[PDB]
């Protein structure tokens, strides 16, 4: 047979690639396994090439070497990068032909019943690039490409060779090589999912379990839940770092390296090591697509009164409508209120509570010093990314800062305004749904520009109005004792107040800098001085 | 010509047999020749098969083939010496047997590698001199194949050296049918192919495919059928008990077509259907009036001799359904050329880009015999803001000029513009440019609203009775798009609250003109 009779999937050690390996076997190794008679009756030819590609550290080389191990054949030939190039003219092609000489001789000698020969190319893009589009200085590269093309499939027919190639940039490869007969099976390797992450971790923890060197408090399922966007190499590095942390307890240094011995026979790896390494040693190379919600919500949310709940309720309702509607695949809403009321935090909370696959926030904090064309390009890119998903949500905050508005004259950028109107009007591709949430603090200006009618609904976000709400907020914050609260109530309860929560936090922080006998008076003075408002 | 196993190139081979071997087969006395052929085309079209079968068909010596740049050598004088070893036998036969000499065939594979600096130019010069030099041969034929014909040296293509230039192209439906027959005959002969499979459907489906891709698709189908009798996970198996009985169903071919092979060419995207989503429902007389006016304008454009150009403007308030009716009129026009110009396709552009796009659309329109063009959201096209106000004058002037330029002699053009702000256009002095105008109104009375709700069929009788109690005795002012939005918002809550929420929203939106 062509398969080493001592073989199994488990001993290979590949975690997350189940569909890909099955497809590879199905599409490349079915012909050589069945009885020759039926194959001859069908009169079909065998595959001669495979192309693996993907992002770094996903398992291409591991897959290739395991495949080489799986077969019973001659030892595979490996080409390590551009180790074929030479300075004397005509010597690269000789090196290339030396690779196929043995297979050609064996085929000529034995006919159709000869063995298989495997050749592996790594970093294939180094040697194989488009003949026409390259540095027009020396013709060595084009001749190398021509020789390879001729040798793989020439006038003389060679049919007992399999060629594997792996790369990181598939596009650069010349098209004439990626056609049926040379390399038709083109697989893609990508980042794993939760199940694949669990499989990889279980693969890499087995030997530690076998010899009773792993603590029972470790839970691999929780680890797989936590490690989001990690890859195989990172998942192995995390285990290596945890093992190093566990080992370092028994070594004493800073004058001479001593490794104990009495206590070196009772070593175990706990969960504290994993938790410590997750936060100090390893960071995912792929930038977290998850939004940094902690930045937008920095002090949580406290239910100081009724309106908060109401606002959230409205948002929930809107979400439901955009999830269970087909006549209106696009919905919009605008949050407006006085300054320092907490519109951005509420919008972020509403966006987060939903479970949509795609969620992004567009802010002016990133477009500093940008022209009015760069802003349009950025918005267009964000919306283009949004269109791909089946369910999308987008948040546009600080609209007045996105248009460069100043009341003197006034002045603003018109290109961004027109782009925003057009984007708000149009709908996504067929069978997809999009939700948009806008935030602003000046509604009359937007009304003048005639964009308030482009939205579908509006929600109002008021600030603290009565003294009872102020007392509730203070109780939730817990910055003052009961004795101080009695004094504060004795004055505030009589009348109404008009202040935002952010300003309230600022005032509290400013007040707490005085000596204990003066803090209440400072707070009252600040509230009376800055509180002149409706 | 299908015997050789290549389909879709019968005519090319007829040309070959005419232009190449007619002199050799024609009786010698009346004759009392051509020595160059170059085949080019995209990869996988059967050039190697052509060369091999050409070598086999003639009764001559075994052809000599050089595989790529084997001639190049590190030493001096070896690259040129390698070429002279190819023609030794031809010279010997020419000098000994004279005219009565056998034909010699030379095949050059990837000839662009050695023809196109001391080595390469000397090689090319030696080849040129040997093929056509002081001594003239009449019993040699040289064949070359290329995938990049634009990288070959010009001096090699002159008459007397490379005469017969040929192009291989992607086969048409009949050629693809021939190829599928060739690659499925072996399966059919042994009854290993299921009876449900139709070759004609496969031929119609496989658009833009080449021969190699078709053979790969067939191979993928075979592999899909074969894997059914293969076991993995623990060890590789052949089954045998069921493998002996292997049939290739249609599902295998369909699945192989979905993923394993792809055409590898581009795709076209259509947007017109997007402009009418919910259709047109007749809730009153005005829609019929608008459609009748559109038909009158279309007929006037069709049967006019000294008014080849006609323009119209559609007027109405927001959320009234103007673009949908314009698209409907354009569709009912039944003109060979129809297009829609929208600002959705131009986001972030400057004035010059918009002008160029509009000019390109109108240039395309001018080529046909009778054409129709619709422009919607004029105020968005020439971006307008009430503050200042501010707008783009270049686009305004371009539109003004284009609105009164007639097409070439004997051709017809219709233009339909839509807007929701007529006073602004009147101030710009563009309302005069158009020939006529039409008005698109809102829903005015409660009877029309009830008819529209009946057509939509969202509410049942019990709630319609209460709605009629509330609305029938009053005037209303609402669009249809906003009406659908309101209905969808109201439907969200539980069945108890729906009517009250709907009427609360209606009261919120109530207004008068």
């Amino acid at each position: 047979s062509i398969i080493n009779p001592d073989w199994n999937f488990e001993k290979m050690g590949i975690g997350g690639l189940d569909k890909e390996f099955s497809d590879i076997f199905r599409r490349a190794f079915a012909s050589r396994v069945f009885p020759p008679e039926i194959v001859e009756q069908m009169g079909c030819k065998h595959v001669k090439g495979i192309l693996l590609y993907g992002p770094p550290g996903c398992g291409k080389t591991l897959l290739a070497r395991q495949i080489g191990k799986m077969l019973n054949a001659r030892e595979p030939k490996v080409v390590n990068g551009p180790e074929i190039l030479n300075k004397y003219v005509g010597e690269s092609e000789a090196n290339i032909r030396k690779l196929f000489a043995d297979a050609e001789e064996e085929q000529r000698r034995l006919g159709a019943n000869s063995g298989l020969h495997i050749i592996i190319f790594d970093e294939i893009d180094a040697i194989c690039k488009q003949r026409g589009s390259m540095a027009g200085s020396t013709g060595v590269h084009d001749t190398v490409v021509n020789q390879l093309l001729s040798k793989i499939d020439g006038v003389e027919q060679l049919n007992n060779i399999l060629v594997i190639g792996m790369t990181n940039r598939p596009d650069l490869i010349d098209e004439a090589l990626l056609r049926p007969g040379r390399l038709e099976v083109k697989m893609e390797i990508g980042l794993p999912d939760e199940k694949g992450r669990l499989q990889i971790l279980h693969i890499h923890t087995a030997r530690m379990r076998g010899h009773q060197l792993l603590s029972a408090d470790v839970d691999i399922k929780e680890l797989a839940v936590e490690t989001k966007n990690f890859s195989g190499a990172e998942l192995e590095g995390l285990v290596r770092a945890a093992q190093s942390t566990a080992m370092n307890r028994h070594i004493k240094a800073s004058t001479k390296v001593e490794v104990d011995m009495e206590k070196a026979e009772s070593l175990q790896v706990t969960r504290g090591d994993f938790l410590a390494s997750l936060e100090n040693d390893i960071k995912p190379a792929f930038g977290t697509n998850q939004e940094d919600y902690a930045s937008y919500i920095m002090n949580g949310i406290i239910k100081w009164g009724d309106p908060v709940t109401r606002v959230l309720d409205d948002g929930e309702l809107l979400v439901q409508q955009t999830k269970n509607s087909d006549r209106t695949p696009l919905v919009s809403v605008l949050l407006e209120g006085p300054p320092h009321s907490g519109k951005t935090a509420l919008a972020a909370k509403i966006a987060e509570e939903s479970n949509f696959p795609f969620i992004k926030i567009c802010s002016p904090d990133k477009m500093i010093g940008f022209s009015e064309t760069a802003k349009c390009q950025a918005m267009k890119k964000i919306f283009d990314d949004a269109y791909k998903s089946q369910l999308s949500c987008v948040v546009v905050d600080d609209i007045e800062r996105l248009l460069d508005y100043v009341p003197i004259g006034p002045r603003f950028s018109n290109l961004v305004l027109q782009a925003l109107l057009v984007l708000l009007k149009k709908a996504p591709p067929q069978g997809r749904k999009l939700l948009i949430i806008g935030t602003t603090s000046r509604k009359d200006v937007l009304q003048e520009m005639e964009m308030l009618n482009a939205f579908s609904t509006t929600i109002h976000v008021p600030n603290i109005a009565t003294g009872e709400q102020l007392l509730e907020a203070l109780e939730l914050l817990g910055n003052f004792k009961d004795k101080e609260r009695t004094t504060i109530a004795q004055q505030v309860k009589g009348k109404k107040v008009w202040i935002g929560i952010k300003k309230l936090l600022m005032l509290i922080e400013m007040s707490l800098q005085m000596d204990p006998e003066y803090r209440v008076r400072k707070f009252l003075a600040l509230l009376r001085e800055e509180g002149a408002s409706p | 010509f299908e015997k050789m196993g290549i389909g879709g190139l019968d005519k090319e081979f007829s040309d070959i047999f005419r232009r190449a071997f007619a002199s050799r087969v024609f009786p010698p006395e009346i004759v009392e020749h051509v020595k160059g052929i170059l085949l080019y085309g995209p990869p996988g079209c059967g050039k190697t098969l052509l060369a091999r079968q050409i070598g086999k068909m003639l009764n001559a010596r075994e052809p000599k083939v050089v595989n790529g740049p084997e001639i190049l050598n590190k030493y001096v004088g070896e690259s040129e010496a390698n070429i002279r070893k190819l023609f030794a036998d031809a010279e010997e036969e020419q000098r000994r047997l004279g005219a009565n000499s056998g034909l010699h065939i030379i095949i050059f594979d990837e000839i662009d590698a050695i023809c196109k600096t001391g080595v390469h130019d000397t090689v090319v010069n030696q080849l040129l001199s040997k093929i056509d030099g002081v001594e003239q041969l009449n019993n040699i034929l040289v064949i070359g194949m290329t995938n990049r014909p634009d990288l070959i040296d010009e001096a090699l293509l002159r008459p007397g050296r490379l005469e017969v230039k040929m192009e291989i192209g992607l086969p048409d439906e009949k050629g693809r049918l021939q190829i599928l027959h060739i690659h499925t005959a072996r399966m059919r002969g042994h009854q290993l192919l299921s009876a449900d499979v139709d070759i004609k459907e496969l031929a119609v489906e496989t658009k833009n495919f080449s021969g190699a891709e078709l053979e790969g698709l067939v191979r993928a189908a075979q592999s899909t059928a074969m894997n059914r009798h293969i076991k993995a996970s623990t060890k590789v198996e052949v089954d045998m008990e069921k493998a002996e009985s292997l049939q290739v169903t249609r599902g295998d071919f369909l699945a192989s077509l979905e993923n394993d092979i792809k055409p590898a060419f581009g795709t076209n995207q259509e947007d017109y259907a997007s402009y009418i989503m919910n259709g047109i429902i007749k809730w009153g007389d005005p829609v019929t009036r608008v459609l009748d006016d559109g038909e009158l304008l279309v007929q006037q454009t069709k049967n006019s001799d000294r008014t080849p150009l006609v323009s119209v403007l559609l007027e109405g308030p927001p959320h009234s359904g103007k673009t949908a009716l314009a698209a409907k009129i354009a569709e009912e026009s039944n003109f060979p050329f129809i297009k829609i110009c929208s600002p959705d396709k131009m986001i972030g552009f400057s004035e010059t880009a918009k002008c160029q796009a509009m000019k390109k659309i109108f240039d395309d329109a001018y080529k046909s015999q009778l054409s129709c063009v619709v422009v919607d959201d004029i105020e968005r096209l020439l971006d307008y803001v009430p503050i200042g106000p501010r707008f783009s004058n270049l686009v305004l002037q371009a539109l003004l000029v284009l609105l009164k330029k007639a097409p070439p002699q004997g051709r017809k053009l219709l233009i339909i513009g839509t807007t929701s702000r007529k006073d602004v256009l009147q101030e710009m002095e563009m309302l005069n440019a158009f020939s006529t105008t039409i008005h698109v109104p809102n829903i005015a009375t409660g009877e029309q609203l009830l008819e529209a709700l009946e057509l939509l069929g969202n509410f049942k009788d019990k709630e319609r009775t209460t709605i009629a109690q509330q609305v029938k005795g009053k005037k209303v002012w609402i669009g249809i798009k906003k009406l659908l939005m309101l209905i969808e918002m109201s439907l969200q809550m539980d069945p108890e609250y729906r009517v009250r929420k709907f009427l609360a929203l209606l009261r919120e939106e109530g207004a008068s003109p």
């Binding site: 300075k87 004397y88 003219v89 200085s137 020396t138 | -």
Partner: peptide, 16 residues
């Protein structure tokens, strides 16, 4: 316009 900048070269050897 600006005139294309200066560029480096690669070299190839030959035996005899």
């Amino acid at each position: 316009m600006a005139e294309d900048a200066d560029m480096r070269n690669e070299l190839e050897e030959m035996q005899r």
